[PDB]
Amino acid sequence: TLVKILHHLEEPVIFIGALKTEPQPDEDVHCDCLVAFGHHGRMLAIKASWDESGKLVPELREYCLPGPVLCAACGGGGRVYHSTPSDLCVVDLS
Amino acid sequence: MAVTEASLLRQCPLLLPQNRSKTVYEGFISAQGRDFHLRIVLPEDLQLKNARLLCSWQLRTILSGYHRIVQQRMQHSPDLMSFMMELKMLLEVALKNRQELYALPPPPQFYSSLIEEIGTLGWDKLVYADTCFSTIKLKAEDASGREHLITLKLKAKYPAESPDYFVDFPVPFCASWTPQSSLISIYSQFLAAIESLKAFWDVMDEIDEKTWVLEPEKPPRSATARRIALGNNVSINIEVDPRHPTMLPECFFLGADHVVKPLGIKLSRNIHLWDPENSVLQNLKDVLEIDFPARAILEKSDFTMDCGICYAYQLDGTIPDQVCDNSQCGQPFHQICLYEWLRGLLTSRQSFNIIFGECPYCSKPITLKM
Amino acid sequence: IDDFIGSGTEQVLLLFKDSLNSDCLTSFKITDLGKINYSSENRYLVVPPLETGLKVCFSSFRELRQHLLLKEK
Ligand SMILES: [Zn+2]
Ligand SMILES: [Zn+2]
Known part of the structure; x- marks a missing residue:
């Protein structure tokens, strides 16, 4: 010199990243799923479906996970490590 | 009703006219024990050719790849009534395909009553309970001292409906499930099924120890047939009756036709010298006048x-x-x-x-x- | 009190009296008050299912709370 709005979790955002779901060494891995966090423990999950019409459609979940989520990160093979002020938990998408 | 004065309320209770001219409806829609937000603005006349239909972002998630279907439905649909009938029918479809999001148990009935009934059994029995508590697996012993498992799969209401009972042994297992019956009921039934085969398991364990079993390899408890080898390059396949195991089984011979002839011929002579006081092996050795080799497996x-x-x-x-x-x-x-x-x-x-x-x-x- | 083990969880360390030996950290007791107990299978089988049942019922509770707030609004 435009900005697009996608989903809107109602609660604040903490973490954005990506995962390699369906993991069937190289550093740049071509990520299949997309991940975002809410705080009050809304998790957003996205994937490519291409199902029932033979056309790409975005498969959304919205999970409601326990605990006020403080921080998270991604590990090898569709795994996310996140934390509640109780416990450090893990999630397998794979 | 005929008119959507009353039929609208009777089919969509949760649709409240905000504006005086019944033009903005808002509030909710019901769907498989699940109510959702809706904000459905009409034009200055009653026309769905032009209509704004806004949602919860929760609702956008569940109307994934029907955005166009419902856009069609809005322009082709006569009335708002009919639109809502379709939008319900459609949600029911979307969610029944996405049927892997549902099912909360009744905690005041279930978790405790299940802890109660497992206390009724005893804690030494339980071997597996799933983290959804849906599957469990239980242990029983035979009079012989053999472990027999039973898998159960549980519904949201365990005591109401039958739990799916899966178990290895070959005769079809029958569990008289009432809403009054419990884990202890079906456990007694399980022990009853164990003992009807108690002689049967002994005959099978005897064959499996003393003879070169060939063609079940680590046999389950479900196998009633036992392909025994004898000498080399001749075999006998043996199906036993589980209620009369010690009694004469249907048995016959595989291999070279010059080797099978005298064996069949001697079985026909000596089949009346079968006696159900001895074991299956202690009757076959004196009927066919042979021994069995002990696992020609490891040398050959x-x-x-x-x-x-x-x-x-x-x-x-x-x-x-x-x-x-x-x-x-x-x-x-x-x-x-x-x-x-x-x-x-x-x-x-x-x-x-x-x-x-x-x-x-x-x-x-x-x-x-x- | 600290995590001496390198598990993640804190434990409590207790030192019993100097009459036993004229030496530090003889006659100790390390404990977490749960599983971990260091010193000088139907019980411990069926807890995670029950705990996850608690957490799922907690998420349902939390869900209905939010739903009701919306309804009121
Ligand atoms: Zn062949
Ligand atoms: Zn030949």
Whole structure:
């Protein structure tokens, strides 16, 4: 010199990243799923479906996970490590 | 009702006219014990050709790849009534496909009552309970001292409906489930099924210890047939009646037709000298006047007991059974392999559902009966 | 009190009296008050299912709370 709005979790955002779901060494891995966090423990999950019409459609979940989520990160093979002020938990998408 | 004054309320209770001219409806829609937000603005007249339909972002998630379907439905639909009938029918479809998001248990009935009924059993029994508590697995002992498991799968209401009962043993397991019946009821039924086979398991464990079992390999409790080997390159397959196991089983012989003849002939002489006081083995040894070898497995670890056409054991359930009537070849084969060999060649000559031909390895007369 | 083990979880360390030996950290007791107990299978089988049942019922509770707030609004 435009900005697009996608989903809107109602609660604040903490973490954005990506995962390699369906993991069937190289550093740049071509990520299949997309991940975002809410705080009050809304998790957003996205994937490519291409199902029932033979056309790409975005498969959304919205999970409601326990605990006020403080921080998270991604590990090898569709795994996310996140934390509640109780416990450090893990999630397998794979 | 006929009119959507009353039929609208009667079908969508949760649709409240904000504006005076009934033009903005808002509030909710019901759907599989699940109410959702809705904000459905009409134009200055009642037209759905132009209408704004905004949602919860939760609702956008569940109307994934029907955005166009419902856009069609808005322009082709007569009334708002009919639109809502369709939007409900449609949600029900979307969610019943996405049916992997649902099912909360009733905690005041379930978790406790399940802890209660497992206390009724005793804690030494339980071997597995799933983290959804949906599956559990339980243990019982025979009078012999054999472990018999039972898998259960549980519904949202365990005590109301039957839990799905899965168990190895061969006769079909029957569990008289009432809403009053419990884990202890079905456990007693399980012990009843164990003891009706108690003699049966002993006869089978006896055969499995003392004889070269061939063709169940680590047999389950479900197997009633036992392909025993005897000498080498002849076998006997044995189906036993589980209610009369010590009693005479239907038994017959595989191998070379010159070796099977005296064995069948001596079984026919000595089948009246069967006695159900002895074991199955202690009657077969005196009927057929033989011993059984103890696992010619470990010495004959590669004798190539493979088809010698395709060179595999286990082609599609079939075993190497068809052999040569020759001392110098003795080469086993399969039904499929030997048939696709003897039909392909010129020399081969078929009577009705038999092929006579030459053994591939030694070129001697070999007979195949389909 | 600290995590001496390198598990993640804190434990409590207790030193019993100097009459036993004229030496530090003889006659100790390390404990977490749960599983971990260091010093000088139907019980411990069926807890995670029950705990996850608690957490799922907690998420349902939390869900209905939010739903009701919306309804009121
Ligand atoms: Zn073959
Ligand atoms: Zn031959």
